[PDB]
Structure formats: C-alpha cells, structure tokens
Amino acid sequence: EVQLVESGGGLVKPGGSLRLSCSASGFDFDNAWMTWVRQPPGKGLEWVGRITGPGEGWSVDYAAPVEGRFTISRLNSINFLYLEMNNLRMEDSGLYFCARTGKYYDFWSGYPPGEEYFQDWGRGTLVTVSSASTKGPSVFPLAPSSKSTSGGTAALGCLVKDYFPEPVTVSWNSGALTSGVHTFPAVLQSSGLYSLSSVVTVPSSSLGTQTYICNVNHKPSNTKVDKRVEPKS
C-alpha cells in the first residue's frame, strides 16, 4: 500500500525558481531515505539528489549540475519530501520523480558506503523550463540528391529551422504532391527551439521541368513560407 505523489510542475522562465513536493504514505517515512530523479522527454533518467535519515543527521547529496541551485528538504509529521530549484536552466526540464530509497551493503564483498536503490516511485511531475517567446521558422531548401535514393529518383527537401512552439505543417506544391513525402518529427534543440525537415523523393527526369515548392506553415507565429527547391547549378 505504498503511495508516492509528486506535485508542483509547470512552465518557468529560465532564470526562475520552483518548489516541488512529494507526498508519502504506506511506509515508515520518518526513517526512510528519499531521492529525487528526473527524465527529460524522450531521454534517460538522471539522479538529482538524496536526503538521508536521522542518524545520518539528514545529510544531503547533489549531482554536480545542481549543486547550490537545488535544495532538498523534508517535513516528517505530514510525510512530505521537497525540492527547491533556483536559477533554472533549459537542461533542468523534465519529469521529476521522488523515490523511496533503500540502502545496501554486503559485509564480505562490499565497499563503503555500499549502494542505494529505488524501491518505490511516484508517477512524477512535469517541469518545463523554456523562455517561451513565439519564434517563426527559417526555411532553407535541401537541394536534390540522387545518391541515397532508388534508381531514376532523387530526394529534395526543406529544412525548417528554429521555430517555437510546435507545430509546423509541411505540404508540397500546395498539397498536389503527397506521394513520397517524409516529414520528420522535430528535434527539440538545447536552445529550446525546434527544427524539422521534410523531404520528397521524385523522378530524376522531372528535375528540369517540374517545379517543387514546400509550403511551410507556422500558425503560432502566423508565418507561411513557400520555398522553391531547385537543383544546385
């Protein structure tokens, strides 16, 4: 019957602060060690920090990327763990979990101070650090190349660079060209901005006679771009 519930996630400007809270029930909280863990969307888990128990004097440790900016704390009568983050960065964006943390040490084979492990977890609370300013895309043509494509065909594209927020839509020749289009999911860059690419594979013999235009649309910035994509000369 062990229940861990994190709270306090939300949009923050990248100089700001945020306090997170982890409610606990179903175990002896007052003596339990607790760890905070984060995961950026589509990426790995990262150990944030850990508060010890009585008899360790509630000593606290922190991963190097958060020393001095982050402060772990707790209040035991109501079983609530806490995480105060100041001077946030885009790197700090992610799903933050609180974990009930056991301690392990094998007398014969161990080495101090053994290891810690995360026996129970909450479902986490979502932290988005971005300096949200609408940004319209820059669109550049990706000129036709036949190297990677099937016989008689060529791939050409548009790179859709540094926009915010999602989404952008891409069509080709005003939607008259659907066949052979691959519009790739966006990357979220460390700058907090998105980029994507769309490519179409077409007959090589059409390159001299058929005009190709990518119609890029970014509704949040009210920007439309029609980029003609020619062969390099």
Binding site: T52, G55, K103, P112
Partner: peptide, 21 residues
C-alpha cells in the same frame, strides 16, 4: 539511529582486519 556511512566504514575496516589476520 546509527550512521550508515560510519557503520559501513566500520564494517569495511573490520573486514580488512579479519582478512589480514
């Protein structure tokens, strides 16, 4: 209410002793 770090060191130190002897 002992100290996990100190205890684990204590145990580590005791294992060396036992191994030496």
């Amino acid at each position: 209410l002992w100290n996990w770090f100190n205890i684990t060191n204590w145990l580590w130190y005791i294992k060396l002793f036992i191994m030496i002897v």
